[PDB]
Short mmCIF file of all heavy atoms in Angstrom, two decimals:
data_model
loop_
_atom_site.label_atom_id
_atom_site.label_comp_id
_atom_site.label_asym_id
_atom_site.label_seq_id
_atom_site.Cartn_x
_atom_site.Cartn_y
_atom_site.Cartn_z
N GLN A 1 157.82 141.80 88.45
CA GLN A 1 158.32 140.49 88.03
C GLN A 1 159.78 140.53 87.61
O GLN A 1 160.50 139.54 87.76
CB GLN A 1 157.45 139.95 86.90
CG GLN A 1 157.87 140.44 85.51
CD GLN A 1 157.05 139.81 84.40
OE1 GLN A 1 155.87 139.53 84.55
NE2 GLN A 1 157.70 139.57 83.27
N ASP A 2 160.25 141.69 87.13
CA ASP A 2 161.65 141.83 86.74
C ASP A 2 162.62 141.67 87.91
O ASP A 2 163.79 141.37 87.68
CB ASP A 2 161.85 143.21 86.09
CG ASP A 2 161.81 143.15 84.58
OD1 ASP A 2 162.14 142.07 84.04
OD2 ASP A 2 161.43 144.17 83.95
N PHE A 3 162.15 141.86 89.14
CA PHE A 3 162.97 141.82 90.35
C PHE A 3 162.86 140.51 91.12
O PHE A 3 163.80 140.15 91.83
CB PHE A 3 162.60 142.96 91.30
CG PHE A 3 162.69 144.30 90.69
CD1 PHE A 3 161.57 145.06 90.48
CD2 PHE A 3 163.93 144.80 90.29
CE1 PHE A 3 161.67 146.32 89.89
CE2 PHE A 3 164.03 146.05 89.70
CZ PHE A 3 162.91 146.81 89.50
N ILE A 4 161.72 139.84 91.03
CA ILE A 4 161.51 138.64 91.84
C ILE A 4 162.06 137.46 91.07
O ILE A 4 161.63 137.18 89.94
CB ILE A 4 160.02 138.46 92.18
CG1 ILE A 4 159.68 139.23 93.46
CG2 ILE A 4 159.70 136.98 92.39
CD1 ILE A 4 158.24 139.67 93.57
N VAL A 5 163.05 136.79 91.67
CA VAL A 5 163.69 135.62 91.06
C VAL A 5 162.86 134.36 91.29
O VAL A 5 162.58 133.60 90.36
CB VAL A 5 165.12 135.45 91.60
CG1 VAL A 5 165.92 134.54 90.72
CG2 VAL A 5 165.80 136.80 91.66
N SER A 6 162.45 134.13 92.54
CA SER A 6 161.56 133.03 92.86
C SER A 6 160.90 133.31 94.20
O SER A 6 161.44 134.04 95.04
CB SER A 6 162.31 131.70 92.92
OG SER A 6 163.49 131.83 93.69
N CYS A 7 159.72 132.74 94.38
CA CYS A 7 158.93 132.95 95.59
C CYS A 7 158.69 131.62 96.28
O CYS A 7 158.04 130.73 95.71
CB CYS A 7 157.59 133.64 95.26
SG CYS A 7 157.63 135.48 95.23
N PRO A 8 159.17 131.44 97.52
CA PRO A 8 158.94 130.18 98.24
C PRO A 8 157.51 129.99 98.71
O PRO A 8 157.29 129.47 99.81
CB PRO A 8 159.89 130.27 99.44
CG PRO A 8 160.53 131.60 99.41
CD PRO A 8 160.15 132.33 98.18
N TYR A 9 156.52 130.39 97.89
CA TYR A 9 155.10 130.24 98.22
C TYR A 9 154.25 130.69 97.03
O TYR A 9 154.76 131.34 96.12
CB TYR A 9 154.73 131.01 99.50
CG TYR A 9 154.73 132.52 99.36
CD1 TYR A 9 153.54 133.23 99.31
CD2 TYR A 9 155.92 133.25 99.34
CE1 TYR A 9 153.52 134.59 99.17
CE2 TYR A 9 155.92 134.63 99.23
CZ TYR A 9 154.70 135.31 99.15
OH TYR A 9 154.66 136.69 99.05
N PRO A 10 152.93 130.34 96.99
CA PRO A 10 152.10 130.76 95.84
C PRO A 10 151.85 132.26 95.76
O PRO A 10 150.89 132.78 96.34
CB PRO A 10 150.79 129.99 96.07
CG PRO A 10 150.79 129.60 97.51
CD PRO A 10 152.23 129.36 97.84
N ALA A 11 152.70 132.97 95.02
CA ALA A 11 152.60 134.41 94.85
C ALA A 11 151.45 134.79 93.92
O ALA A 11 150.78 133.92 93.36
CB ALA A 11 153.92 134.96 94.30
N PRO A 12 151.15 136.08 93.80
CA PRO A 12 150.32 136.53 92.67
C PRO A 12 151.04 136.36 91.34
O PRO A 12 152.24 136.66 91.21
CB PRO A 12 150.06 138.01 92.98
CG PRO A 12 150.79 138.32 94.30
CD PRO A 12 151.10 137.02 94.94
N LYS A 13 150.30 135.87 90.34
CA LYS A 13 150.91 135.51 89.07
C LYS A 13 151.09 136.75 88.20
O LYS A 13 150.10 137.43 87.89
CB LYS A 13 150.07 134.46 88.33
CG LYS A 13 150.21 132.99 88.80
CD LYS A 13 149.10 132.54 89.77
CE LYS A 13 149.45 131.20 90.44
NZ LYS A 13 150.52 131.33 91.48
N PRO A 14 152.31 137.07 87.76
CA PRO A 14 152.49 138.20 86.84
C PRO A 14 152.10 137.87 85.41
O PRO A 14 152.43 136.80 84.89
CB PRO A 14 153.99 138.50 86.94
CG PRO A 14 154.62 137.21 87.35
CD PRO A 14 153.60 136.51 88.22
N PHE A 15 151.38 138.79 84.77
CA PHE A 15 151.22 138.73 83.32
C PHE A 15 152.56 138.93 82.64
O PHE A 15 153.50 139.48 83.23
CB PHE A 15 150.26 139.81 82.83
CG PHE A 15 148.88 139.70 83.40
CD1 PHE A 15 148.49 140.53 84.43
CD2 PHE A 15 147.99 138.78 82.91
CE1 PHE A 15 147.21 140.44 84.95
CE2 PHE A 15 146.72 138.68 83.43
CZ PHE A 15 146.32 139.51 84.44
N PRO A 16 152.68 138.53 81.37
CA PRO A 16 153.96 138.73 80.67
C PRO A 16 154.26 140.21 80.54
O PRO A 16 153.36 141.05 80.54
CB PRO A 16 153.71 138.08 79.31
CG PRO A 16 152.56 137.14 79.54
CD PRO A 16 151.71 137.79 80.55
N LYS A 17 155.55 140.54 80.42
CA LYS A 17 155.96 141.94 80.46
C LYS A 17 155.57 142.65 79.17
O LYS A 17 155.80 142.15 78.06
CB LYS A 17 157.46 142.08 80.67
CG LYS A 17 157.94 143.45 80.19
CD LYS A 17 159.44 143.61 80.27
CE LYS A 17 159.83 144.90 80.95
NZ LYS A 17 161.30 145.16 80.84
N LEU A 18 154.99 143.85 79.31
CA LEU A 18 154.74 144.74 78.18
C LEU A 18 155.89 145.74 78.10
O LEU A 18 156.16 146.47 79.06
CB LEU A 18 153.39 145.46 78.33
CG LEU A 18 152.73 146.04 77.08
CD1 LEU A 18 153.54 147.15 76.46
CD2 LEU A 18 152.51 144.96 76.03
N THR A 19 156.56 145.77 76.96
CA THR A 19 157.71 146.64 76.73
C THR A 19 157.23 147.88 76.00
O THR A 19 156.72 147.78 74.87
CB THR A 19 158.79 145.91 75.92
OG1 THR A 19 159.50 145.00 76.78
CG2 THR A 19 159.77 146.90 75.27
N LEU A 20 157.38 149.05 76.63
CA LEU A 20 157.02 150.31 75.99
C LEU A 20 158.22 150.96 75.32
O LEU A 20 159.33 150.95 75.86
CB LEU A 20 156.41 151.31 76.99
CG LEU A 20 154.97 151.10 77.50
CD1 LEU A 20 154.06 150.60 76.38
CD2 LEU A 20 154.91 150.19 78.69
N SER A 21 157.99 151.54 74.13
CA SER A 21 159.02 152.35 73.47
C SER A 21 158.44 153.59 72.82
O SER A 21 157.73 153.48 71.81
CB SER A 21 159.77 151.52 72.42
OG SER A 21 161.02 152.10 72.13
N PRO A 22 158.70 154.80 73.34
CA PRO A 22 159.41 155.12 74.59
C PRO A 22 158.56 154.85 75.82
O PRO A 22 157.37 154.54 75.74
CB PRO A 22 159.70 156.62 74.44
CG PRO A 22 158.50 157.13 73.68
CD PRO A 22 158.19 156.02 72.68
N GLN A 23 159.15 155.02 77.00
CA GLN A 23 158.47 154.82 78.27
C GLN A 23 158.10 156.15 78.96
O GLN A 23 157.60 156.13 80.09
CB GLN A 23 159.35 153.95 79.19
CG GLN A 23 158.59 153.00 80.10
CD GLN A 23 159.37 151.72 80.45
OE1 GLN A 23 160.45 151.44 79.89
NE2 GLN A 23 158.84 150.95 81.40
N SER A 24 158.29 157.29 78.30
CA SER A 24 157.95 158.60 78.86
C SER A 24 157.71 159.59 77.73
O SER A 24 158.19 159.41 76.61
CB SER A 24 159.06 159.11 79.80
OG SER A 24 160.02 159.89 79.11
N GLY A 25 156.95 160.66 78.04
CA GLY A 25 156.76 161.76 77.11
C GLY A 25 155.36 162.34 77.08
O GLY A 25 154.44 161.84 77.73
#
């Protein structure tokens, strides 16, 4: 969802973004 600006058709709906801190380890 962070990359798709808009979709000229009914796309799959993204859930809201989950922000991880940290994202690795």
Side-chain angles (χ1 to χ4, degrees):
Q1 85 176 34
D2 263 333
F3 303 113
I4 273 153
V5 197
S6 48
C7 272
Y9 70 106
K13 281 98 192 73
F15 299 102
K17 159 185 229 189
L18 201 295
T19 283
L20 285 321
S21 200
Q23 215 151 352
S24 91

